Structures are given as C-alpha cells and as structure tokens.
C-alpha cells in the first residue's frame, strides 16, 4: 500500500508541449532536442506520448481541458511536460502567459475522476523568475493530493538551456531515467537529477553577468505513495 498501483493496462499519457517559436507580440534554441529526448525516454517507459509544438495559451488550456475529460480508467498515471519561457507560477503559450495553476486544476481529484488516486506528474522546464545562482566553491482525499511538480529550477530563478545539447534539467532528467527507472523510486531518481544538474553543469558565457552560473531544480511533491515505473 506504500507504492502506487502501476499495473493498469496502460501506464498513461505523456503530453509534451514544446514551445519554440513565439509570436512577435525569442526562439528557444535546442528545445527540439529536449522534446526528442523526452519522447524517446517516456516511450521506453511505456507511456503514450503525444508531442505538441508551438501552442498558443488558448490551445494549451483547451488541450489540457480535453485531456482531462478523457477516460483515464485503464491508465496508471499521467504525465505532462511543459517546455517554454516562464515566470513564477506562469508558463508561456506562443502568444502569451498562462497560470500554471489553471493547467494543474483540470486534473484535481474532483475534476478529473478517472485519475483520482493516481500519480499526476508535471515536469516544467521554464524560468521561475530572473535570478541567477552564482554558486559557491566546494470528502475523503484532498483534491490537491497525488500531484508531483518536477521543476527545472528553484522559485525565482532562471532555468538554463543549451542551444546544442538541450536544457540542463531535461538532459539530466532523461539520463537518470534511462539509467535508473528500472531500479530507483521516482523521488530518488529526481534527487540524482538534482545532483547531476547541481554538480555537472556550469554556465559558460561571453557576458560576465551570465557566466559561471549554477542551477538547482525543484522537486515539489504532493504524492501520497512511492512511484516505480518498473
């Protein structure tokens, strides 16, 4: 009873929203690498992956609305990966911002019944503000329960991306998942993603202001059980 039931006929949906190009009301280079890395990773995890690209904020809201009205009865879990510009509490559609809460709420235990009591995972590769990390040298269940919000970055802070390799967080996320999804619990996997990102990445910039900076992702868990993909 300490781990989620993950042997439903279907693992669940993995929705990937990849916003690369924003209306001229900048281009997020290397995000396609991430979108590709995630598709492959969650394919191996036996998720039903749907990749979307370059969605307006209206499209994002309606995409998430429709997915939440689907019947998830045969599915163990739900995954949504958000790839875009962001601010604290905010993700950008191609033509502007939308409140993260507004997305999360379609899947509340009371509004998406076929996911009640099943893990709902939101993986957010976006800025949570404009701070840089300079580093240092070494009524029966709550409607908000059973969400996991894996943030690329601490609140208030930039999230780093590499134009060639993909974002730091997704790079590390996919790598740890590949190596450890058949061994470790999900929080313990996410904790190595924290260490990988914290220890192996350091920004290189011609602009002193953005040079030699660091990043620590942020695991936010409302889960009530342990999660194993295996």
């Amino acid at each position: 009873d300490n781990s989620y039931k993950m042997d439903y006929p279907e693992m669940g949906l993995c929705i990937i929203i990849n916003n690369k190009n924003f209306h001229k009301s900048t281009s997020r280079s290397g995000t396609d690498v991430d979108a590709a890395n995630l598709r492959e990773t969650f394919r191996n995890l036996k998720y039903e992956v749907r990749n979307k690209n370059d969605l307006t904020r209206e499209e994002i809201v309606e995409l998430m609305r429709d997915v939440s009205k689907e019947d998830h009865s045969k599915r163990s879990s739900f995954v949504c990966v958000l790839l875009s510009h962001g601010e604290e509490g905010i993700i950008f559609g191609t033509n502007g911002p939308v409140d993260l809460k507004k997305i999360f709420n379609f899947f509340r235990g009371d509004r998406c019944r076929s996911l009640t009591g099943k893990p709902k995972l939101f993986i957010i590769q976006a800025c949570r503000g404009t701070e840089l990390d300079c580093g240092i040298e070494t009524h029966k269940i709550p409607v908000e329960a059973d969400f996991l919000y894996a943030y690329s970055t601490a609140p208030g802070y930039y999230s780093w991306r590499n134009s060639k390799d993909g974002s730091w967080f997704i790079q590390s996320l996919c790598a740890m998942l590949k190596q450890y999804a058949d061994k470790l619990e999900f929080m313990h996997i996410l904790t190595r993603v924290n260490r990988k990102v914290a220890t192996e990445f350091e920004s290189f910039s011609f602009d002193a202001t953005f040079h030699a900076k660091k990043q620590i992702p942020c695991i936010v868990s409302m889960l009530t059980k342990e999660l194993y993909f295996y």
């Binding site: 962001g86 976006a126 999230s159 991306r161 134009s163 290189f204």
Partner: peptide
Amino acid sequence: DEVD
C-alpha cells in the same frame, strides 16, 4: 548556454 542561454537562460530560457
């Protein structure tokens, strides 16, 4: 390396 670029900020998102």
